[PDB]
Amino acid sequence: IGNKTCVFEKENDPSVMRSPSAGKLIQYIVEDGGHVFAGQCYAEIEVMKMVMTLTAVESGCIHYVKRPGAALDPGCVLAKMQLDNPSKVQQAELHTGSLPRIQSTAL
């Protein structure tokens, strides 16, 4: 803004596994409650009549939200993973106020 800089964080912190696309869930690869490592496939979904797996981002204990056989939407909640919470805990405190409103340009 002008000659000043402000940096906003894009939320990716809750460590919730999400479907990248629409489609259908066929099955899960690992046990509910089992530990998964980053890069390991944890789920099998099909969109396009063409099967695409799903790799975990973080290493932790996975618990599944959707049961095997389910409709998937992009960005939906598929499976949560428990991690050791290095940081970024409770970075919400959702602002509930009102933005500045002095002018109006209504003539």
Place this chain on the structure above:
Amino acid sequence: EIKFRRKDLVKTMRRVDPVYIHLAERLGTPELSTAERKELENKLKEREEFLIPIYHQVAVQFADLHDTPGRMQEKGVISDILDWKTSRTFFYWRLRRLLLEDLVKKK
């Protein structure tokens, strides 16, 4: 998707799931209290929604029992039910029979 939509699935759950049965029977008691009825209704909603995917798999299994070769054999749309491992022998002797029958029938 045509004959066993959600409404009928819920009707099925009404007579199967012990938890949903217990809650449904408890809510049937006249004049318990306002608060208790509200709690029971929310419990019923959560339980019936939670049980949809499993009873959906049950439903398609039920429908699958209608598509078996036993039914086709009773209705007379197939000739017989065969085993794979011995199909070679069966079809050999059958085709031999049919060819000889064709010869005599042409005569």
